[PDB]
Amino acid sequence: SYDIQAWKKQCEELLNLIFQCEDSEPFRQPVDLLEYPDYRDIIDTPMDFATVRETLEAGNYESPMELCKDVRLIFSNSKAYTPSKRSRIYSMSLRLSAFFEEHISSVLSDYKSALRFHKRN
């Protein structure tokens, strides 16, 4: 399965599934500072799923590794902003992360295999 471009539609598909998940609701749009005015004192680089989807559709990811780095930043930002492990929004981030990781693993493997096949000779 050596299609070097297949990861893009696979990532679009996976973002559609993440948008259907009720657990994505807090992460679907950039954090609002009016409710969280301290947010940028804690978080250096905000990230959200709408920004990831727009970056993909603009043609501004070169690989699924780059997309994966931004999605992982959504989750590390939640983990750094939470005052406790027993946070509703943090617990939503941890279920959504498990779902994402379960689905992205084949996307990454197939892409990396395709690149290795391209440079086989």
Ligand X SMILES: CCCCNC(=O)N1CCN(C(=O)c2cccs2)CC1
| Helix, strand, or coil (residue 73) | helix
Rounded to whole angstroms, the Cα distance separating 52 from 88 reads 23
* Beta carbon of residue 118, minimum distance to ligand X (angstroms, whole number): 39
Q: Which residue is nearest to ligand X (CB)?
A: 78
Q: Is 20 exposed, middle or buried (0-12, 13-18, 19+ CB in 10 A)?
A: exposed
**11 Cβ contact partners less than 8 Å away, ≥ 6 residues apart:** 56, 61, 64, 67, 107
Strands (DSSP E) found in 1-121: none
Site string for ligand X, 4-33 (x = CB under 6 A): ----------------------x--x-xx-
Nearer to ligand X, 16 or 29 (CB): 29
* Beta carbon of residue 55, minimum distance to ligand X (angstroms, whole number): 18
Site string for ligand X, 35-74 (x = CB under 6 A): xx--------------------------------------
List residues near ligand X by CB under 6 A: 26, 29, 31-32, 35-36, 78, 81-82, 87, 89-90
